[PDB]
Design an enzyme around this catalytic site. Sequence first.
Site, PDB file in Angstrom:
ATOM      1  N   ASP A  93       0.778  -1.226   0.000  1.00  0.00           N
ATOM      2  CA  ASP A  93       0.000   0.000   0.000  1.00  0.00           C
ATOM      3  C   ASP A  93       0.818   1.288   0.000  1.00  0.00           C
ATOM      4  OD1 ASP A  93      -1.788   2.094   0.577  1.00  0.00           O
ATOM      5  OD2 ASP A  93      -3.125   0.715   1.625  1.00  0.00           O
ATOM      6  N   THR A  94       0.950   1.914  -1.168  1.00  0.00           N
ATOM      7  CA  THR A  94       1.712   3.151  -1.280  1.00  0.00           C
ATOM      8  C   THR A  94       1.064   4.331  -0.549  1.00  0.00           C
ATOM      9  OG1 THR A  94       0.690   3.695  -3.424  1.00  0.00           O
ATOM     10  CG2 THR A  94       2.741   2.443  -3.461  1.00  0.00           C
ATOM     11  N   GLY A  95      -0.190   4.170  -0.144  1.00  0.00           N
ATOM     12  CA  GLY A  95      -0.868   5.242   0.569  1.00  0.00           C
ATOM     13  C   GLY A  95      -0.638   5.201   2.071  1.00  0.00           C
TER      14      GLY A  95
HETATM   15  C1  LIG Z   1      -0.344   9.136   7.859  1.00  0.00           C
HETATM   16  O1  LIG Z   1      -1.258   8.046   7.956  1.00  0.00           O
HETATM   17  C2  LIG Z   1      -1.156   6.975   7.132  1.00  0.00           C
HETATM   18  O2  LIG Z   1      -0.321   6.786   6.232  1.00  0.00           O
HETATM   19  N1  LIG Z   1      -2.168   6.085   7.461  1.00  0.00           N
HETATM   20  C3  LIG Z   1      -2.394   4.802   6.792  1.00  0.00           C
HETATM   21  C4  LIG Z   1      -3.685   5.070   5.999  1.00  0.00           C
HETATM   22  O3  LIG Z   1      -4.822   4.741   6.370  1.00  0.00           O
HETATM   23  N2  LIG Z   1      -3.445   5.709   4.847  1.00  0.00           N
HETATM   24  N3  LIG Z   1      -4.438   6.085   3.924  1.00  0.00           N
HETATM   25  C5  LIG Z   1      -4.289   5.285   2.701  1.00  0.00           C
HETATM   26  C6  LIG Z   1      -4.696   3.839   2.814  1.00  0.00           C
HETATM   27  C7  LIG Z   1      -6.190   3.599   3.168  1.00  0.00           C
HETATM   28  C8  LIG Z   1      -6.728   2.153   2.952  1.00  0.00           C
HETATM   29  C9  LIG Z   1      -6.026   1.133   4.026  1.00  0.00           C
HETATM   30  C10 LIG Z   1      -6.374  -0.372   3.955  1.00  0.00           C
HETATM   31  C11 LIG Z   1      -5.568  -1.291   3.161  1.00  0.00           C
HETATM   32  C12 LIG Z   1      -5.911  -2.692   3.097  1.00  0.00           C
HETATM   33  C13 LIG Z   1      -7.057  -3.189   3.821  1.00  0.00           C
HETATM   34  C14 LIG Z   1      -7.855  -2.286   4.609  1.00  0.00           C
HETATM   35  C15 LIG Z   1      -7.526  -0.886   4.683  1.00  0.00           C
HETATM   36  C16 LIG Z   1      -8.289   2.179   3.121  1.00  0.00           C
HETATM   37  O4  LIG Z   1      -8.832   2.741   4.069  1.00  0.00           O
HETATM   38  N4  LIG Z   1      -8.928   1.531   2.128  1.00  0.00           N
HETATM   39  C17 LIG Z   1     -10.399   1.359   1.962  1.00  0.00           C
HETATM   40  C18 LIG Z   1     -11.021   1.797   0.634  1.00  0.00           C
HETATM   41  C19 LIG Z   1     -10.632   2.889  -0.254  1.00  0.00           C
HETATM   42  C20 LIG Z   1     -11.392   3.096  -1.479  1.00  0.00           C
HETATM   43  C21 LIG Z   1     -12.531   2.230  -1.804  1.00  0.00           C
HETATM   44  C22 LIG Z   1     -12.904   1.146  -0.904  1.00  0.00           C
HETATM   45  C23 LIG Z   1     -12.130   0.953   0.309  1.00  0.00           C
HETATM   46  C24 LIG Z   1     -12.334  -0.100   1.359  1.00  0.00           C
HETATM   47  C25 LIG Z   1     -10.996  -0.092   2.141  1.00  0.00           C
HETATM   48  O5  LIG Z   1     -10.225  -1.135   1.536  1.00  0.00           O
HETATM   49  C26 LIG Z   1      -7.961   0.989   1.209  1.00  0.00           C
HETATM   50  C27 LIG Z   1      -6.643   1.661   1.456  1.00  0.00           C
HETATM   51  O6  LIG Z   1      -6.597   2.649   0.462  1.00  0.00           O
HETATM   52  C28 LIG Z   1      -4.306   7.523   3.588  1.00  0.00           C
HETATM   53  C29 LIG Z   1      -4.436   8.420   4.816  1.00  0.00           C
HETATM   54  C30 LIG Z   1      -3.380   9.383   5.066  1.00  0.00           C
HETATM   55  C31 LIG Z   1      -3.448  10.264   6.210  1.00  0.00           C
HETATM   56  C32 LIG Z   1      -4.574  10.208   7.137  1.00  0.00           C
HETATM   57  C33 LIG Z   1      -4.617  11.132   8.302  1.00  0.00           C
HETATM   58  C34 LIG Z   1      -5.344  12.400   8.224  1.00  0.00           C
HETATM   59  C35 LIG Z   1      -5.394  13.309   9.359  1.00  0.00           C
HETATM   60  C36 LIG Z   1      -4.712  12.961  10.598  1.00  0.00           C
HETATM   61  C37 LIG Z   1      -3.982  11.704  10.695  1.00  0.00           C
HETATM   62  C38 LIG Z   1      -3.935  10.796   9.560  1.00  0.00           C
HETATM   63  C39 LIG Z   1      -5.644   9.229   6.884  1.00  0.00           C
HETATM   64  C40 LIG Z   1      -5.578   8.337   5.726  1.00  0.00           C
HETATM   65  C41 LIG Z   1      -2.380   3.653   7.909  1.00  0.00           C
HETATM   66  C42 LIG Z   1      -2.622   2.280   7.218  1.00  0.00           C
HETATM   67  C43 LIG Z   1      -0.970   3.567   8.568  1.00  0.00           C
HETATM   68  C44 LIG Z   1      -3.405   3.852   9.059  1.00  0.00           C
END
Ligand SMILES: COC(=O)N[C@H](C(=O)NN(CCC[C@@]1(Cc2ccccc2)C(=O)N([C@H]2c3ccccc3C[C@H]2O)C[C@H]1O)Cc1ccc(-c2ccccc2)cc1)C(C)(C)C
Lengths: 99, 99
Positions: free
Chosen positions: B25-27
């Site tokens: 996951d690059t995100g």
């Molecule tokens: C800096 O934080 C991060 O990098 N957090 C990661 C994260 O979620 N990153 N997402 C990016 C990743 C989000 C992921 C994670 C995932 C992966 C596999 C299985 C289940 C879930 C997610 O939530 N997904 C959902 C999604 C999306 C579109 C359509 C359907 C679905 C259903 C889920 O699968 C897929 C990934 O994209 C972007 C992001 C960046 C900053 C803040 C923040 C905004 C404000 C304050 C603090 C943080 C909140 C979110 C962690 C995995 C480490 C939690």
Amino acid sequence: PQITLWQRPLVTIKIGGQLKEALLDTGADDTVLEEMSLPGRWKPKMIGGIGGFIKVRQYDQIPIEICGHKAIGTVLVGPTPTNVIGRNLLTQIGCTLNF
Amino acid sequence: PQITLWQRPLVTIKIGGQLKEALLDTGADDTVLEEMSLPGRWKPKMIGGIGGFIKVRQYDQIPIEICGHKAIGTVLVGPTPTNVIGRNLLTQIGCTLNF
Ligand SMILES: COC(=O)N[C@H](C(=O)NN(CCC[C@@]1(Cc2ccccc2)C(=O)N([C@H]2c3ccccc3C[C@H]2O)C[C@H]1O)Cc1ccc(-c2ccccc2)cc1)C(C)(C)C
């Protein structure tokens, strides 16, 4: 081009006549953007990531431009903390992971 | 190798001598795995996802193999719907985005 991952892979996209910054996310099935207006029909949906689920509106066949690439796909709109470009659109621009 | 995104980028990882399925996951800034046992002491960390914030256990300098590639880094253990490999480890295996 080649995008390294030392930093978050952020790009500028053009959608609905607006310019927004989004994260290239290989973990996301679809693109999810913060509240905005989009034309056409939509249907409610729940998506669950870390922290739980959020409710979003699903819009299909939405034109979007990323890195100079004009593509079309599904866009989910709702209270996401950050804009994310998912696989549904990444494929259209020929984006792949390499190592 | 080169991985397209038409399907979820799921790969096999090896940690603590056990094989598990994980998503590249690059995100994600960090790597978060489903409940499991790891050696040593852990530190607390709060991470934010699309649905909100969760509390996780942070373990450092942990050996982990991703698609056969060796890495040693920080792993977070907490309530996640799937094991996710984040940028901290993608950088160690030399993974990049290309298009
Ligand atoms: C800096 O934080 C991060 O990098 N957090 C990661 C994260 O979620 N990153 N997402 C990016 C990743 C989000 C992921 C994670 C995932 C992966 C596999 C299985 C289940 C879930 C997610 O939530 N997904 C959902 C999604 C999306 C579109 C359509 C359907 C679905 C259903 C889920 O699968 C897929 C990934 O994209 C972007 C992001 C960046 C900053 C803040 C923040 C905004 C404000 C304050 C603090 C943080 C909140 C979110 C962690 C995995 C480490 C939690």
